[PDB]
Scaffold this active site. Sequence first.
Site, PDB file in Angstrom:
ATOM      1  N   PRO A 158      42.194  36.993  42.102  1.00 59.29           N
ATOM      2  CA  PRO A 158      41.424  37.233  43.331  1.00 59.29           C
ATOM      3  C   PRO A 158      39.974  37.599  43.065  1.00 59.29           C
ATOM      4  O   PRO A 158      39.567  37.768  41.913  1.00 59.29           O
ATOM      5  CB  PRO A 158      42.157  38.399  44.002  1.00 59.29           C
ATOM      6  CG  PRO A 158      43.497  38.405  43.407  1.00 59.29           C
ATOM      7  CD  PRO A 158      43.349  37.906  42.011  1.00 59.29           C
ATOM      8  N   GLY A 159      39.206  37.718  44.139  1.00 53.93           N
ATOM      9  CA  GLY A 159      37.764  37.843  44.039  1.00 53.93           C
ATOM     10  C   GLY A 159      37.140  36.576  44.567  1.00 53.93           C
ATOM     11  O   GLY A 159      37.828  35.682  45.050  1.00 53.93           O
TER      12      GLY A 159
ATOM     13  N   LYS B 173      40.890  33.135  30.933  1.00 51.61           N
ATOM     14  CA  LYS B 173      39.523  32.736  31.226  1.00 51.61           C
ATOM     15  C   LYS B 173      39.125  31.428  30.597  1.00 51.61           C
ATOM     16  O   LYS B 173      38.342  31.402  29.653  1.00 51.61           O
ATOM     17  CB  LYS B 173      38.536  33.809  30.788  1.00 51.61           C
ATOM     18  CG  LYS B 173      38.595  35.064  31.593  1.00 51.61           C
ATOM     19  CD  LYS B 173      37.251  35.699  31.626  1.00 51.61           C
ATOM     20  CE  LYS B 173      36.474  35.337  32.882  1.00 51.61           C
ATOM     21  NZ  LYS B 173      35.380  36.317  33.068  1.00 51.61           N
TER      22      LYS B 173
ATOM     23  N   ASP C 158      37.015  43.235  26.446  1.00 53.22           N
ATOM     24  CA  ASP C 158      37.371  42.524  25.242  1.00 53.22           C
ATOM     25  C   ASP C 158      37.897  41.167  25.656  1.00 53.22           C
ATOM     26  O   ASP C 158      38.408  41.010  26.761  1.00 53.22           O
ATOM     27  CB  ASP C 158      38.436  43.288  24.460  1.00 53.22           C
ATOM     28  CG  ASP C 158      38.754  42.645  23.132  1.00 53.22           C
ATOM     29  OD1 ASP C 158      38.066  42.939  22.136  1.00 53.22           O
ATOM     30  OD2 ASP C 158      39.698  41.842  23.087  1.00 53.22           O
TER      31      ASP C 158
ATOM     32  N   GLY D  40      34.453  32.231  40.944  1.00 49.94           N
ATOM     33  CA  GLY D  40      33.284  32.256  40.102  1.00 49.94           C
ATOM     34  C   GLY D  40      32.568  30.939  40.012  1.00 49.94           C
ATOM     35  O   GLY D  40      33.189  29.879  39.975  1.00 49.94           O
TER      36      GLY D  40
END
Lengths: 547, 539
Positions: free
Chosen positions: B309-310, B329, B356, B313
Site C-alpha cells: 500500500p501507499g 523491491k 537495509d 511509486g
Amino acid sequence: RGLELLIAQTILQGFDAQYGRFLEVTSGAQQRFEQADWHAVQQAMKNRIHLYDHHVGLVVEQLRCITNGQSTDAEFLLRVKEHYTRLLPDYPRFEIAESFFNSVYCRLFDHRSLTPERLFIFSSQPERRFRTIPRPLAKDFHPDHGWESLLMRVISDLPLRLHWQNKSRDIHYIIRHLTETLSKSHLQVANELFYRNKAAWLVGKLITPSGTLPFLLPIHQTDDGELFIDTCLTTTAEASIVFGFARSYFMVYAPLPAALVEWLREILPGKTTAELYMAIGCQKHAKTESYREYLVYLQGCNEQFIEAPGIRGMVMLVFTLPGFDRVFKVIKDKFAPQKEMSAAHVRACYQLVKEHDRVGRMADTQEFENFVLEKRHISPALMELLLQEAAEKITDLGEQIVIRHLYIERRMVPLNIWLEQVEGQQLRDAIEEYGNAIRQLAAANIFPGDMLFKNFGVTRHGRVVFYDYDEICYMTEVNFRDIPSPGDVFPEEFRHWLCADPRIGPLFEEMHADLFRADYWRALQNRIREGHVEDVYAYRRRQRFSV
Amino acid sequence: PRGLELLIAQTILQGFDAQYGRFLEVTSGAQQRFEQADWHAVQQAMKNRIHLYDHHVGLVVEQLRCITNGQSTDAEFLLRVKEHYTRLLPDYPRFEIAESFFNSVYCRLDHRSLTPERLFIFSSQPTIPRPLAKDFHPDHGWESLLMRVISDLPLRLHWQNKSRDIHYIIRHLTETLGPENLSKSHLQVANELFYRNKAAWLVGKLITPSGTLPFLLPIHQTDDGELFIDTCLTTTAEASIVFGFARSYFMVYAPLPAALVEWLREILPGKTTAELYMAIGCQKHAKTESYREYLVYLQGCNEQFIEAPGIRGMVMLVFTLPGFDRVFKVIKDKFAHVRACYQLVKEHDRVGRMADTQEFENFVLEKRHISPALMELLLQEAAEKITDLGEQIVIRHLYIERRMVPLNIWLEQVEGQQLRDAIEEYGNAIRQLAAANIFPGDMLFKNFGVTRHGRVVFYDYDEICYMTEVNFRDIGDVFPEEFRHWLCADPRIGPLFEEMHADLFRADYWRALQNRIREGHVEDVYAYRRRQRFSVRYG
Ligand SMILES: Nc1ncnc2c1ncn2[C@@H]1O[C@H](COP(=O)(O)OP(=O)(O)O)[C@@H](O)[C@H]1O
Ligand SMILES: Nc1ncnc2c1ncn2[C@@H]1O[C@H](COP(=O)(O)O)[C@@H](O)[C@H]1O
Ligand SMILES: [Mg+2]
C-alpha cells in the site's frame, strides 16, 4: 592482465586460510580440557602442523591450473613479490603473510630459485617495531588488597567453568613462593591462557621495585575430575625450561603473535625472536627467522663450518660452527648404485617427531629442500666427507655447493663426551636424567631403539635430550623379551653396552634398577594402550606441591 | 579421480576463511580506531568489511572457472562438488556461513537452475567451546560490581570521574526493579563490545528472577577522551532499536557467530535469525536464512502476493503479502543508476533513517501466489527481463526491505499527540541524513514509512545524493522554502511543522550545516529517545 595479481591474491588467501583454521584449532583446547578428550589433545598439534602445508599444497597446485602461458621467468616471478607486498601495509600478520609465500616458491622451484628479491627472506619495510598490539593483549592487575585478594581475581575471571578444588587452599600456597623476597609491585596476568598437554598455563609478569620477573601459574586436574593450580614459577631459570626446545610449543589463541612474541620477550630474556614464534605454534616463521638470525652469525664472525663433536654417525652427516647454537643434519647416499627414491624411513622419524609430543627428551628441527652453502665457509676437511658421503645429495654451484633436505636442531653437547667430563655429584644426575629420559620416552610412545650414550644431548643446567631419529618406533611396534626374530627387543641385552664404564654402570643401579629388566617395558607399552599416557611436568618432580 | 572434485570443493572453503578471518582482523580493529577517535576510518571499515565476502567469491570464481579449463559449469559435477563440501563441514564451527558462502559462488558463476539439489541456502542444511560471556554477582554491592565488570574492559583512554556512573546506573535499575529486588539480581555480560559509529557498547543480560531481562550501556566520549555511559538500557523494547534495521552494521568480534547470535536471543525475544545475524554484519547468512524465512512462511499460508500500500511509486515496483513483514523491491525498468544509488545507502552508515536491502539478480516465485491484479503490473511495467515458465517466473536484480507502514497514510490514521509524536520524527528524519551526508531529492511523506515503535525512515534513495553535490541557494539546486508547499499542505498536519521543524525551510540550516561535514565532523546519531541520556533530565 591480473595474471600476477590473481596469483598474489591466491597465495595470500592460502595464508589467510592457513591461519584461518590455525586459531580455531588453537581455540578448542579450553573445552578439550573441561571435556575429557586427551586423545584429542595429543592429536591437535598434529592438525596444527599440517594446515600450513595443507594450505600451500593447494595454492601450489591451483597455481599450476593456469600457470602455462608465461608461467615462469623471474621476469614476472617478481611482479608477484611486488604485487603481493604492496597489499600488506595494514596487514599486522604480514610477517607470516610473507612467510607463506616463501615455502610456496621453494616448493614450485625445488626450494632452489635465486636470492634476495626472489623471495621474502627478510621483512619488508614495516619492518622493525612490533608494536602491532591494537588491544592490550593482557590486563594490568594492581595490588590494592594485595596478594590474598587480587590473585583471587585471576582465578575468578578465568573463563574456566568447573568446580575448582580448593582455590582457597591455593591462595595460602602461592604466597609461600612470593615471600622468597611485594605489593609495591603490580600484577599483569596475560590473555589468553597458555595451553599445552594435560595442563593450562596462566602467564604473567610480576613487576617488582628491585626488578621485574616472570610469574607462571599452571592449572591442573585430578584425572578425570578435580582441578588444582600447581606450583608457582617466577624464575628466569624456570621460564626457559617450560618454554623449552625439547618440549612441544603452545596453544595460545593468538591472531597476532609478532606482538605477543613481544610481551613474553621479557618473560624469557635469553630467548630468540625465532624461539618465540616456535612456542606460540608459529614454527613456520621460526624457520624464516632462525635462518634470518643464522645468516647474521656467520655473515658476521670467524670462521667456518666444522664437523660436529662426539661420534660420527652411521647415517647422518652433522656440521656446525664453533660459536653457534645449532647443528645441521645431512643424510648420506650409502653408495653410487643406491638410488634415493623416497619415503624415507629416516625423514619419517624426523617428521614423526614433527608432530609427536617430545616432553623434554627430544628436540625439534627445520627443513630446507635446497640449501646453498658458502664454498668459501667450507673447510676442506668437512667438504671431503661432505662431498663423497653425500655426493648424490649435493651439487657444486660455482662459488657455492648445494645440499638437499638438511636438518637443523639446537646444538647440544654429546652425552658421551660430557659423561667423561664430569664425575662426582655431577656424575650422579647424568645417569638419572638418562634413564628418566628413557622412562619418559617410553611413556610418550617413544622407544629409543639405539639407546647408546651419545645419541642424547645436554643443557647448561644439565639434562638429557635424545636426537637420533632412525632407530625410533612406537612402543606398540616392538615386542619385549630376552629370555633364552625381526623387530623384537631384548631389554637386558642393554646391560652390556651401557654398564660398560665401571664408573657409571654401577651407579645405574642407584637409579635404574628396572630398565635393564623386561617386565617393566610391557608395563609402559601396555599402559599406553589402555588409552593412558602420563603427560609431562615442566618442572622437577621435587618442586611439586604434592611432595 | 584426478580431477576437480576435491581441488574444487576446497578451493571454495578457502576463500571462505581467507575471507572471515580478515573479517575479524577489522572487526577487532574498531576499538583501536574508536579509541584513537579516528572516526573517518570507522566509516571506511564499514565499507571495507562490507567488501570482503564479495571479493573472495569473485576470486574463487576466477580461480574456479580457471581451474576447470574453458567454459562449462556442469550440474552433476555441481553435485559431485557439493557432496565433498559437507564432508569437510563437520568439525566446522562457522560452518553455518560456509554453506552460505557456497551459494554466493554458484550465483556468481546468473544463478541458473538454482537449487535444492545443487546448494544449501538455509538455516543449516542439516556446549560452547570457549569463553562467551561472564557472570557478576551483587555480593559486595552493585556500586562495586559496576567498577568490577569495567576493569576487565580493553579501553586504554583514562576514564574521567567514573565516580558518578556507578551511582548513576543504579537508579534506572532502582526505580524500575526495587531496592529489595536488586539484592540478588545478577549480571551476564558479553566478553566483547559492540562498536558502531561513535560507540563502544556494553552488551550484557541482566538476571533478575523477576524475569530474564536485557541490559545495555553505551560507552561515549567526546573531543579529548572523556568516558562515561550514555544512558542505561534495560526493558525489552529498547534493544530492537539499538540492534534495529534502519541501522548501520554492528562490530563485535566473534569467531563463532552461532553462539553469539544464539546468546543474544532472549534479550528482546524479537523475531528472527537473519535479523540477529545481520546485527553483526553476517548479512550473507542473513541473505540466506531470510530465504528460509522466505520459504517456511508461505508453506501453510493461504495468502497471495500483492502490491504494498501507499501511493504507487514513480520510483519502484513493489510486492508483498498480508502478514509478511518484508517488502519486495523489483526496480522499475524504463522509468542502472539504482544499481549504484541503491547501494550508496548499503555502503553507508544507515542512520535508522534508511532501510537495509538485499539484492537478488535471478529470484523465483510460485505464480500461484500471484494475483493477476499484480500479474500484468509485474508482467508489463517490469517486463524488460521477464521470464515466464508455465507455472513459475524468475525476477532479475530485485532488492528487499522490512515493510514498514507508509507515512502519508500513517498521518490520517493519526491525530492527537499521535501527530505531534509522528511529525517530530519526520523532520528529525530529514535532519539526520544531512548530518549523515545524505540528501532526499524527493522527500515526501509518500516515500517514508513507520517502524514498530513509531519511527519514520527514508526508503527512497532513488533520488539520493551526498549533500556534497548540491547547493541550497537563498532567495542539484534545491529550494528549501518551496518544500512547505508540498510539506505544509494540510491544515491538520502542516502548522505543527512551523512549530518545530521551521529550520528545515530556511536555507540557512541547509547550507550552514554542510560546512559542518567538509570540515570533518561526524554526526552524533543516537539509538535512544534522546531524553534518555544520563545528563539530560537526570542531574
Ligand atoms: N643436536 C646435536 N647435538 C650435538 N651433536 C649432534 C647433534 N646432532 C647430531 N650430532 C652429532 O652428529 C652425530 C650424528 O648423530 P645421529 O643423529 O645419532 O645420527 P647417527 O645415528 O648416524 O649417528 C651424533 O653422534 C652427534 O655427535
Ligand atoms: N539469485 C539468488 N537466488 C537464491 N539465493 C541467492 C541469490 N543471490 C544470493 N542468494 C543468497 O544470498 C547469499 C549472498 O550471496 P551474494 O549476495 O550473491 O554474494 C548467498 O549465499 C545465497 O544464499
Ligand atoms: Mg649417534
